[PDB]
Design a protein around this ligand. Structure first.
Ligand code: CDL
Ligand code: CDL
Ligand code: CDL
Ligand code: CDL
Ligand code: PLX
Ligand code: PLX
Ligand code: PEE
Ligand code: PEE
Lengths: 104, 70, 56, 459, 347, 122, 140, 55, 53
């Protein structure tokens, strides 16, 4: 037969606009297509996007940024009023530290 | 409103982390102790584990054996 | 007539049901890690006259 | 955090019990809902992580990765339904099942408290990806790609497992909290050197590192569109997340074991940026772009500074979004012309203007145009490297140039010029494709508005 | 063959195995081995052909030599210590001879040449029996004399078994030789951990037996002995091919499937001692088993090979005889990993 | 090597010694038991699929028997596993108690008196 | 046997290079003899003189590899005055790989053998230094 | 020069070549009992000398 | 591996022939009956590792 195998021919790609001039590219069924479009737009842009951005924008300050700012304000106020240095190089009290007795 | 509706206070997470840390540290110490116990028991053979069988003594026949010197 | 609508769209309740079940299981898991409730050095506090536990 | 895990395992039977013509709608709607639910995890503390239970915890580094995964699943569903129209119902349900399983595996992987469970899930993510690539890919190369995808990973990850169990025999635990609190320095011995290599090479391969990257162009070209999206957007970030987690026990050895990896990363960044200039395949250009960006992230993680970690997190998120968008843009043209050659379809701006705008925005974001989070991550990594050594700004600078070139090259090659005369099957863009590009791009600028949500725990 | 005679022979095979399993006397263990071999020889030749006869002859020669060496070791051990009970084997020469004889019985490398040949020469049912039930007695004996085993010899043989199984299976288009090679690698994995922990040996044996039973039952269901004949199954029963691919992935050792559970655990046990290099080598080598399993998955499940016209007729008929334990074997082969700690019940 | 084969007082084929009755039985809502039931359900589905029957609705009695049998085996499996772990813990604690020399408790040192080397990251 | 291994390992690293080379060539000869025995058993040579030729070729190649490895390793160790250095073993392994490549008359064989043999010898040196155990004795 | 040739040559291509060669070596046997029974004898002697003599 | 059916059921299928000092016919003693008895009594109930030393 000069052939190698029985096979279907390669089909031509179907155009979604042929049977549906306003096809939205979701499904070949116009009703299912329109409803897929509607749900995608509603739950993607209207619900998740805008409401999620609003929820993120107004998240409570759990990172303690304003708290840290106010604590720094109090601490700077106290240290400037009492004449103490603004920040100490030691973060731990040397009294609670026991270095090795001998360095030789 | 978001904090009231969806989230709790930080003390809950703080103390839950404390409990998780305690459980995990105890588990790690138990694992190390078990490893050392297995090592010692197998090296010495004086514990319940690694007890390999030996011949039963009750099988011996303690009767006169036809000869005075067994 | 709602029989056909139910048999067609009853699968839409699986994910919300899973969500509430997951919330319930998270609460149950939290209930098992109360060994240090109102016992940390940083958040130790005297109980109110009416409340029983600091957090659930 | 079972409130996110259980709804996906409920997506499984819901997809497997839905009607033949409602699988896509149901899957998309409920995956969007799950993404919205997962959006709540961004409320992170400043001192510690959200320790939900003995097995799951959420940090400020993994929460954006979970949000990105949950956001990517509906996009994959929207991109897949075009080329899966002729498939049977059972095979479509199987494809959706594979995607759902991949998402569930990633969700548990990014929140596991122990290193062994993380490894188990991080290796379980292989099976759905391999099945998708080797079954639903288009050309005959996919099979080879699958092999290159699999063993390249395992040959790097199997030794790590041994290392992991060895650590549990020494420290007594593999929980990340106990590991972080009970860290001790690593001495200078050959044993410790090989433990470092065993712990690092798996994640180095997953990034991928230059010289270990040969699997990536194959896997990302031969896989279907959703496969490419999930491979570039999230699966490359597993290596970065794992390296960030594991580098807590490798100090101070890293201080001198980072040298060859740093040199490979910088020089391969330059090399892959240079490769992108001469590419006849449009997908390979995006793949090599991904290699360059991941090399940047590798440099950032290796130098081990808070600024580098912040830049690495930002760049990971931004690159995931950008590469997914670029892959979708290339896939639209491929679906129109059924060929991946770049110089085949030219002058597309005349025929598809809105798609030309999408191409322009994606290319501008790729070359790190300010003030996008791409540029924030790149600039933070650049400053950290300059602090590490003043000479780095040379190599980075070269890359900062070359990148832009090839980016615009791609655009000018596809959108500008004159249309190909003999190509007459270029239909107007569907609403599905425009919505896909819009949903890819709008979160990028939204995160630009609030950049502290993707800067990691070091913020 | 008469069904009554066949059932009697199967009963005698299992009786020999159980006699070896429950005896405290070396002579009774040897007698059990003799009865098992004597009854097993006719089973391999149930379907008479020159290939079956050759397989039976090779199996008989190998097992007779193994029994010779076994009895010589027993007699030497009796000579140097007047004991008949199975214990620590007070003589080292007798212990070495016993280890070599039991390795020859199991098919451990370099005593591995007979396994692919005998497996290819017998039917699928005989191959299932040989690769599952015939491993029980030598493994039980080795577990009972585990303490006296010289680690160097057994570990060398296990390394050789894993390497040779992977390399040999890389080259096979026949499914029975692939299965023989896989068995050779799995027995290497089992015997590597034997001097350290016999519970891991038993766990690996149980997992391997379940996976092998599922695989052989699936291969019997779709009557395919070569790769090409298996490539036609997607056009007849796609579900069988899908379950086959998942089971192959499980045997490959990929997480989170059950096949990952034994090796993982074995590796962990090997790291409770120092033993770092050996588990690394074993995993690197098991990558080869994974490769040829994955090639099989490509050929049978993930791609559609061309079919024939006459297959249309096969679309009109159903499978009359059905395996009752196949779904349970598949489930135990694939979804068992979350039940890992239950292995504490084995010891 | 075997670690509990020759433990003194061990009955050969008991599978559940009397001392095991002193331990709390696993709850019927044990997630391991639910996973065993899920395995039984998956076995039933696979049996339906192999026989070319409607996977979900073909045989309810067979699926119920699958689930029941898997749960029934799993209950005793869980009981035995818990008993074995209890025995291991019991023996380990007894051994550490009876050999205080091999597990000494050395003095605790606070971090204020321990010298740890500092490795700068630059 | 282990008598040959103990003969090789008793001599210090950078001392008495001739004795170390002799021990190495003896070990190589034994390994080549075993390899030739297995090859003859599994692949018969169809002639007695052909089997003798194959045995001689394999044994000479193995002995030459061992002698070169030991000689250059000891020479480098004594020249650099840096014993317990894996670089010496890497040099010896690459020299042995080059010897194998010359014996088989192949450049690619020589390069691959140099790389892999040097790496393996360096690893063996590291294991000797840190006490890595190939066949670990039962501990727990 | 680098990506398409040498990086391929070093890691995956060399690994594939070595595995294929060793598979061809191991799996090619005539199936004659004489050869591998002589191999069994060689193995038994090697085991009694190398491993058993050292105890 | 070893299912001790004999111990469980008290059957004594083959334990009578295991040792030399176990109820010989006509009470004919072994050549080393006394030594074997002494060793068995010494090693009884202490395990293999302990009895070995
Ligand atoms: C300062 C501006 C103020 C604006 C106020 C309003 C802002 C609203 C922003 C909404 C999001 C942008 C839209 C995204 C999708 C595109 C929309 C579309 O499809 O158009 C078709 C639609 C219909 O047209 P058509 O007839 O179909 O056209 C057919 C073709 O498509 C032909 O169409 P075309 O050729 O007209 O193409 C559209 C056009 C525009 O389309 C786009 O390219 C949109 C994306 C721009 C590039 C983004 C990537 C680079 C990184 C930028 C990151 C900025 C993030 C800011 C925060 C955003 C938060 C939402 O393309 C361009 O003009 C090139 C843009 C080059 C921008 C150069 C400047 C870079 C940034 C400079 C600094 C920005 C911060 C300023 C503050 C700093 C401190 C003072 O036309 C429009 O929608 C209007 C176009 C308006 C163009 C504005 C471009 C500048 C926007 C920059 C960011 C604005 C930030 C706003 C917050 C306050 C700051
Ligand atoms: C970790 C988290 C948890 C995850 C657990 C693990 C995964 C799930 C469990 C897995 C076992 C379950 C299913 C096993 C038996 C199914 C056998 C089968 O073939 O399915 C067909 C069957 C459809 O058949 P049909 O309805 O009679 O009509 C169509 C004809 O049969 C027409 O049929 P056909 O034969 O003509 O179609 C031909 C098709 C037939 O071939 C197949 O369908 C492949 C099925 C393979 C079964 C899986 C292997 C054994 C299980 C191990 C899974 C390993 C998981 C680990 C990760 C690795 C992933 C591989 O073959 C192909 O098209 C070639 C495709 C080649 C692709 C190769 C990849 C396949 C492996 C992927 C397996 C992934 C997991 C299973 C996904 C679910 C599958 C149903 O599927 C089903 O409808 C059953 C699935 C749903 C039933 C359970 C739903 C429960 C009730 C709903 C309410 C939920 C209550 C929630 C409580 C809250 C109160 C509201
Ligand atoms: C308690 C457990 C322990 C128990 C075990 C130990 C018990 C010991 C008791 C022994 C008492 C004796 C009882 C007799 C047994 C019956 C033998 C028998 O039936 O013969 C069958 C067998 C086949 O009979 P056939 O089919 O009628 O005749 C076929 C033609 O003969 C040939 O036909 P073709 O022309 O077609 O074939 C070409 C020709 C070609 O022949 C050859 O290729 C062999 C030439 C190798 C040259 C040797 C290298 C020279 C220097 C090495 C020296 C090393 C030490 C010094 C170190 C370095 C010094 C600078 O022959 C062959 O290739 C056949 C393979 C036979 C070769 C020798 C077999 C020994 C094992 C393999 C050794 C391979 C040599 C490599 C180096 C190994 C160490 C020497 O006969 C033979 O293979 C030859 C006769 C062997 C018997 C004499 C020696 C007895 C050895 C006993 C153990 C030692
Ligand atoms: C991660 C990012 C990317 C990285 C990955 C990519 C890059 C790295 C991997 C790729 C490159 C590595 C591949 C190396 C070549 C492999 C050989 C091969 O393929 O064999 C199959 C292939 C087939 O051979 P065949 O079938 O058996 O015979 C047919 C031949 O075609 C017929 O042959 P023929 O008759 O035409 O003539 C052949 C003959 C004559 O060849 C010729 O015909 C023309 C002469 C060319 C020879 C070039 C040497 C003289 C000039 C070199 C000057 C300095 C070198 C640069 C260093 C600068 C220092 C500041 O060659 C010889 O006689 C060899 C004698 C040995 C002397 C040369 C070897 C020097 C080694 C380098 C030492 C470096 C030390 C470290 C330095 C550190 C500081 C920088 O062999 C060849 O055809 C090539 C023959 C020449 C090979 C040697 C060339 C050396 C290449 C550089 C080696 C360094 C890299 C390795 C480092 C690790 C080693 C421990
Ligand atoms: C088509 C036509 C286009 C042109 C016409 C457009 C018309 C104008 C519309 C454009 C608006 C211009 C933007 C100007 C900026 C105003 C908004 C700004 O004020 O809001 C920011 C807030 O922005 C949000 O925080 C960023 C949005 C969150 C991004 C999340 C995306 C949603 C989730 C989707 C899935 C995620 C995928 C990626 C995974 C990581 C302020 O941040 P913050 O300083 O705090 O607020 C201080 C006061 N607070 C704290 C009390 C609230
Ligand atoms: C395609 C890309 C693949 C990925 C590449 C991964 C990169 C892995 C490379 C590993 C980095 C370094 C490894 C070891 C650290 C130092 C290396 C060496 O050069 O340093 C000197 C080592 O000296 C010499 O180099 C001796 C080692 C020689 C043996 C190593 C083989 C080198 C040849 C190159 C082989 C290529 C390897 C990769 C194969 C694919 C330092 O001398 P010394 O102070 O004494 O040793 C320090 C350790 N101490 C403190 C315990 C003593
Ligand atoms: C000591 C033992 C170490 C074992 C190392 C395990 C390596 C795991 C990979 C195994 C690959 C082996 C491939 C092979 O044997 O054949 C080469 C094969 C033959 O083609 P077939 O498909 O078999 O024939 C079909 C048409 N007749 O050629 C190919 O095309 C191979 C294509 C896929 C191979 C991809 C391998 C990628 C490996 C990446 C690096 C990992 C190496 C592993 C070790 C890492 C180093 C520590
Ligand atoms: C696709 C390419 C990806 C390549 C991945 C491969 C890279 C892996 C690098 C080596 C991994 C093996 C390490 C094993 C795990 C180490 C765990 C450990 O710490 O154990 C050490 C032991 O260290 C070792 O034993 C390591 C020996 C290595 C054996 C296998 C060598 C593999 C090849 C080495 C060269 C390649 C390495 C770099 C490759 C880079 C990728 C190209 C400590 O044990 P102790 O004995 O108790 O020490 C104290 C008592 N003396």
């Amino acid at each position: 037969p000069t052939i190698r195998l029985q096979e279907d021919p390669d089909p031509e790609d179907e155009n979604l606009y042929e049977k549906n001039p306003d096809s939205h590219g979701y499904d070949k069924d116009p009703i299912v297509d329109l409803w897929n479009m509607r749900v995608v737009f509603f739950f993607g842009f209207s619900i998740v996007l805008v409401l999620g951005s609003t929820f993120v924008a107004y998240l409570p300050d759990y990172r303690m940024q304003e708290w840290a700012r106010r604590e720094a304000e109090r601490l700077v106020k106290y240290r400037e009023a009492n004449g103490l240095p603004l920040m100490e190089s030691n973060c731990f009290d040397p009294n609670k530290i026991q270095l090795p007795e001998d360095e030789d | 409103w978001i904090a009231r509706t969806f989230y709790d206070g930080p003390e809950k997470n703080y103390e839950k982390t404390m409990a998780i840390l305690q459980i995990e540290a105890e588990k790690a110490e138990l694992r190390l102790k078990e490893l050392e116990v297995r090592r010692l028991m197998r090296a010495r053979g004086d514990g319940p584990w690694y007890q390999y069988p030996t011949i039963d003594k009750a099988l011996i026949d303690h009767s006169p054996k036809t000869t005075p010197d067994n | 007539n709602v029989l056909q609508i139910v048999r067609d769209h009853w699968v839409h309740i699986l994910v919300p049901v899973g969500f509430v079940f997951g919330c319930y299981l998270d609460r149950r898991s939290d209930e098992k890690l109360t060994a240090f409730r109102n016992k940390s050095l940083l958040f130790k506090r005297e109980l109110r006259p009416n409340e029983e536990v600091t957090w659930k | 955090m079972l409130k996110i895990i259980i709804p996906t395992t409920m997506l499984l039977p819901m997809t497997w019990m839905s009607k033949h013509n409602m699988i896509w709608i149901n899957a998309t709607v409920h995956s969007l809902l799950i993404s919205l639910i997962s959006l709540s995890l961004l409320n992170q503390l400043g001192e510690n992580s959200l320790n939900f239970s003995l097995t799951f915890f959420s940090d400020s580094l993994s929460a954006p990765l979970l949000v990105l995964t949950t956001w990517l699943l509906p996009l994959m569903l929207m991109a897949s339904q075009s080329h899966l129209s002729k498939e049977t119902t059972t095979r479509k349900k199987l494809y959706i099942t594979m995607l759902i399983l991949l998402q569930l595996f990633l969700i548990m992987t990014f929140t596991a408290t122990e290193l062994i469970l993380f490894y188990i899930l991080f290796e379980a993510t292989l099976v759905p990806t391999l099945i998708i690539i080797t079954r639903w890919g288009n050309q005959t190369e996919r099979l080879n790609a699958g092999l290159y995808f699999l063993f390249y990973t395992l040959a790097g990850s199997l030794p790590l497992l041994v290392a992991l169990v060895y650590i549990q025999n020494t420290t007594g635990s593999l929980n990340f909290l106990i590991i972080h609190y009970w860290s001790h320095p690593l001495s200078n011995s050959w044993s410790n050197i090989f433990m470092w290599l065993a712990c690092i090479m798996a994640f180095m391969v997953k990034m991928p590192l230059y010289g270990l990257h040969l699997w990536l162009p194959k896997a990302h070209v031969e896989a279907p569109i959703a496969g490419s999206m999930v491979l570039a957007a999230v699966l490359l970030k597993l290596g970065g997340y794992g390296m960030m987690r594991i580098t807590t026990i490798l100090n101070p050895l890293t201080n001198y074991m980072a040298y060859p990896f740093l040199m490979l990363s910088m020089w391969g960044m330059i090399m892959t940026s240079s490769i992108c200039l001469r590419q006849t395949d449009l997908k390979s250009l995006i793949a090599y772009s991904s290699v360059s960006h991941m090399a940047l992230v590798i440099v950032a993680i290796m130098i081990q500074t808070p600024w580098s970690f912040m830049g690495a997190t930002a760049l990971m998120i931004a690159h995931g979004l950008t590469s997914s968008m670029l892959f979708c843009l290339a896939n639209t043209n491929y679906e129109r012309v059924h060929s991946r050659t770049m110089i085949l379809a030219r002058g597309l701006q005349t025929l598809l203007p809105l798609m030309a705008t999408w191409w322009l925005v994606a290319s501008l974001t790729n070359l790190a145009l300010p003030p996008s989070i791409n540029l924030i991550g790149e600039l933070f990594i650049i400053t950290a490297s300059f602090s590490w050594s003043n000479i780095t700004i040379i190599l980075m600078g070269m890359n900062m140039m070359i990148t832009a070139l090839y980016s615009l090259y791609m655009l000018i090659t596809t959108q500008r010029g004159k249309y190909t005369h003999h190509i007459n099957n270029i239909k107007p863009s569907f609403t599905r494709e425009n919505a896909l590009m819009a949903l890819h791009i709008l979160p990028l600028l939204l995160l630009t508005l609030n950049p502290k949500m993707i800067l990691g725990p070091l913020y | 063959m008469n069904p009554i005679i066949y059932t009697t022979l199967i009963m005698t095979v299992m009786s020999g195995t159980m006699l070896v399993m429950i005896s405290s006397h070396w002579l009774l263990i040897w007698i059990g081995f003799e009865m098992n071999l004597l009854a097993m020889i006719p089973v391999l030749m149930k379907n008479f052909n020159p290939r079956a006869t050759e397989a039976a002859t090779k199996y008989f020669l190998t097992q007779a030599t193994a029994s010779m060496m076994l009895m010589m070791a027993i007699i030497i051990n009796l000579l140097y210590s007047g004991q008949w009970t199975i214990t620590k084997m007070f003589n080292p020469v007798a212990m070495t001879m016993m280890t070599m004889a039991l390795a020859m019985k199991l098919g451990l490398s370099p005593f591995h040449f007979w396994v692919p040949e005998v497996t290819q020469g017998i039917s699928l049912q005989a191959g299932l029996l040989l690769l599952t039930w015939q491993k029980l007695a030598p493994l039980s004996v080795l577990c009972q004399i585990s303490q006296s085993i010289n680690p160097n010899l057994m570990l060398t043989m296990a390394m050789l078994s894993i390497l040779i199984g992977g390399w040999g299976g890389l080259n096979q288009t026949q499914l029975r030789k692939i299965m023989a090679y896989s068995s050779i690698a799995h027995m290497g994995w089992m015997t590597a951990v034997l001097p350290y922990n016999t519970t891991m040996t038993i766990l690996n044996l149980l997992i391997y037996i379940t996976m092998t039973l599922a695989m052989f039952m699936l291969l019997i269901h779709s009557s395919a002995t070569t790769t090409l004949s298996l490539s036609h199954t997607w056009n007849k029963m796609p579900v069988i091919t899908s379950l086959m691919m998942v089971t192959l992935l499980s045997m490959g050792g990929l997480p989170p499937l059950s096949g990952f559970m034994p090796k993982w655990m074995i590796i962990q046990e090997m790291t409770k001692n120092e033993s770092i290099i050996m588990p690394t080598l074993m995993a690197m080598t098991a990558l080869l088993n994974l490769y040829f399993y994955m090639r099989l998955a490509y050929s049978s499940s993930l791609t559609m090979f061309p079919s024939t016209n006459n297959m249309k007729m096969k679309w009109q008929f159903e499978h009359t005889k059905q395996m009752k334990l196949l779904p349970t074997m598949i489930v135990l082969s694939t979804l068992v990993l979350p039940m890992t700690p239950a292995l504490s019940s084995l010891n | 090597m075997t670690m509990m084969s020759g433990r003194p007082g061990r009955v050969p084929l008991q599978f559940l010694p009397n001392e095991a009755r002193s331990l709390p039985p696993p709850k019927l809502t044990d997630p391991r038991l639910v996973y065993m039931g899920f395995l039984g359900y998956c076995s039933g589905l696979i049996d339906n699929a192999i026989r070319r029957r409607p996977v979900v609705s073909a045989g309810l009695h067979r699926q119920l028997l699958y689930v029941t049998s898997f749960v029934f085996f799993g209950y005793y499996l869980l009981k035995r596993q818990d008993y074995m772990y209890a025995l291991r813990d019991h023996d380990m604690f007894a051994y550490v108690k009876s050999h205080p020399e091999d597990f000494p408790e050395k003095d605790k040192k606070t971090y204020g008196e321990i010298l740890e080397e500092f490795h700068p990251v630059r | 046997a282990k008598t040959l291994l103990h003969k090789y390992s008793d001599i210090p690293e950078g001392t008495e290079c001739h004795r170390k080379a002799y021990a190495s060539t003896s070990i190589g000869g034994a390994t080549g003899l075993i390899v030739s025995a297995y090859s003859i058993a599994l692949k018969p040579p169809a002639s007695f003189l052909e089997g003798v030729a194959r045995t001689g070729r394999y044994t000479f190649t193995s002995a030459a590899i061992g002698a070169i490895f030991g000689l250059t390793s000891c020479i480098s160790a004594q020249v650099r005055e840096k014993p317990d250095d894996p670089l010496n073993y890497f040099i010896g392994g690459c020299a042995g790989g080059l010897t194998l490549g010359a014996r088989t008359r192949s450049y690619g064989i020589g390069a691959a053998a140099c790389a892999y043999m040097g790496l393996t010898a360096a690893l063996v040196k590291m294991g000797q230094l840190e006490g890595w155990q190939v066949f670990a004795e039962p501990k727990v | 020069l680098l990506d398409l040739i040498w990086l391929e040559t070093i890691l995956p291509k060399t690994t594939s070549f070595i595995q294929m060669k060793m598979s061809i070596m191991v799996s090619n046997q005539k199936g004659l009992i004489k050869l591998y029974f002589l191999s069994f004898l060689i193995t038994i002697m090697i085991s009694m000398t190398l491993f058993n003599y050292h105890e | 591996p070893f299912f001790d059916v004999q111990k469980r059921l008290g059957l004594d299928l083959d334990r009578w022939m295991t040792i030399q000092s176990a109820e010989q016919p006509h009470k004919i003693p072994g050549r080393c009956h006394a030594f074997e008895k002494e060793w068995i009594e010494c090693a009884h109930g202490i395990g293999g590792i302990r009895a070995e030393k």
